[PDB]
Write a protein that binds this DNA or RNA. Structure first.
Ligand SMILES: OC[C@H]1O[C@@](CO)(O[C@H]2O[C@H](CO)[C@@H](O)[C@H](O)[C@H]2O)[C@@H](O)[C@@H]1O
Length: 229
RNA sequence: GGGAUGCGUAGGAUAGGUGGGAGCCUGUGAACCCCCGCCUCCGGGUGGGGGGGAGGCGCCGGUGAAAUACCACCCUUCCC
């Protein structure tokens, strides 16, 4: 009946809204802000000094988190020839060709990432572009999700190679681990995401790039942080 | 500083963006009834209050370009 439940209201008292925390402080506090009945994902949020309306100020990139995402990633790989066996033995959850394209086309969605070899991307683009596109699941050499080293790509994605892309309002968000992680490992992951983010600052972007940065848990409150700590 | 606002069509119906998400809320009072302010696309929405006394919400499915609880950073148009 209030705006929040007693669980959440108990967490809110544990943060200081006026304080900008160091990354090390946030990394250590995060265990206290995670009281859901599952292992909560830790998230980093940044309000960016860009104009999201212009293409040359988009922020899009990937980063390999030093200590991963802390969760299984079901990877569907679309390949042909010897690469099918490569994808299989590299541990992709699903490996198919023409027929798996068909299956996705009819609304099968039970996977977390899609990767593909180049020599199948023609078909994947035309047929699946419409259905994976507006969900960001379409494989693409930009995101490291397309290549003939399909084995290596599957292992990199299982190891928590994330993509990040600002939203139309000028904010950006990413998962960076689990609240059960050791704090130093969380800190490593946070700093790595911030590092990758800053490396994608647009040349013509005006003013401070990271206008604000926050760390939070899946169902908990947030703490504002100093990205340069 | 504080508080509102977000509805083509289809779809429970009022779906602003993205990210997180498989759980969330509830005798620390669910459903439901009633009163008031605000907002309204006139469907309802939202905030508070008076009662009530045990169940709600999400997920899956379905519709859809997008799916919904809960949580985070934001944006639009406004008010005190
Ligand atoms: O998106 C697939 C993956 O995400 C989860 C939550 O982590 O489900 C989310 O995405 C679904 C696909 O649209 C939504 O329907 C669902 O409501 C949302 O939580 C997982 O359940 C799923 O494996």
């Amino acid at each position: 009946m209030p705006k929040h439940g007693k669980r959440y209201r108990a967490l809110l008292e544990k943060v200081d809204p006026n304080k900008i925390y160091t990354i090390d402080e946030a990394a250590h506090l995060v265990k206290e802000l995670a009281t859901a009945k599952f292992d909560e994902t830790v998230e980093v949020h940044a309000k960016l000094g860009i104009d999201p309306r212009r293409s040359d100020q988009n922020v899009r990139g990937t980063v390999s988190l030093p200590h991963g995402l802390g969760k299984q990633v079901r990877v569907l790989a679309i390949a042909k020839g010897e690469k099918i066996k490569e994808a299989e033995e590299a541990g992709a959850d699903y490996v198919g060709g023409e027929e798996i394209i068909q299956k996705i086309l009819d609304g099968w969605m039970d996977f977390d990432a899609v990767v593909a070899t180049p020599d199948v991307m023609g078909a994947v683009g035309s047929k699946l572009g419409r259905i994976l596109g507006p969900r960001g699941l379409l494989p693409n050499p930009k995101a490291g999700t397309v290549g003939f080293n399909i084995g290596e790509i599957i292992r990199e994605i299982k190891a928590g190679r994330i993509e990040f892309r600002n939203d139309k309002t000028g904010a950006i968000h990413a998962p960076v681990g689990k609240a059960s992680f050791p704090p130093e490992k969380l800190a490593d992951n946070i700093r790595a995401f911030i590092r990758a983010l800053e490396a994608h600052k647009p040349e013509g972007a005006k003013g401070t790039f990271l206008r604000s940065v926050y760390v939070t848990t899946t169902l908990g409150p947030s703490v504002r942080i100093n990205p340069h700590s």
